[PDB]
Design a protein around this ligand. Sequence first.
Ligand SMILES: [Mg+2]
Length: 188
Amino acid sequence: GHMECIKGNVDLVFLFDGSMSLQPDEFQKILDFMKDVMKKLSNTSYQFAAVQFSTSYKTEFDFSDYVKRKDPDALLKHVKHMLLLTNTFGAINYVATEVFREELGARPDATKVLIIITDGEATDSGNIDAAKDIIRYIIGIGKHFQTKESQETLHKFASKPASEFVKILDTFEKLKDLFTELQKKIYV
Ligand SMILES: [Mg+2]
């Protein structure tokens, strides 16, 4: 029950896949999921940042942007789908070093949470030692995670145990349902 153990201030980053496999409506459903989560946790001790990744990495908004403009529709208005590869290792290192920074609104007393949303196996390699103080929850969606073997490639990015921190969805429509399952775990 590690998700139920989180208490107090939480700095949560969405790391979302903008790879070439995604159809326009699928990309939009990822955006809507992030908006739904932010709206439901509005006015709690949560604050949010969001990073799109594909071949390279872009901070769509920093924690300090969220604090000023606490409006999910406005914060994500300008997102452009990158349509390239899936460099997940680099992306996690980007979040750990470029996003969780006090200069950008990160709080020193906040538990660090990373929700990763992806529709494919990573196209890079490396390590994520830099993320060892981040709780990592990964959502893998769609046909590229049909096989058990592909599902297990995500375990190396997630916190342990995989049974808690790796969620496989067969379609993008299940994101709405996942949202509901997650609210019951998160204490506010
Ligand atoms: Mg993909």
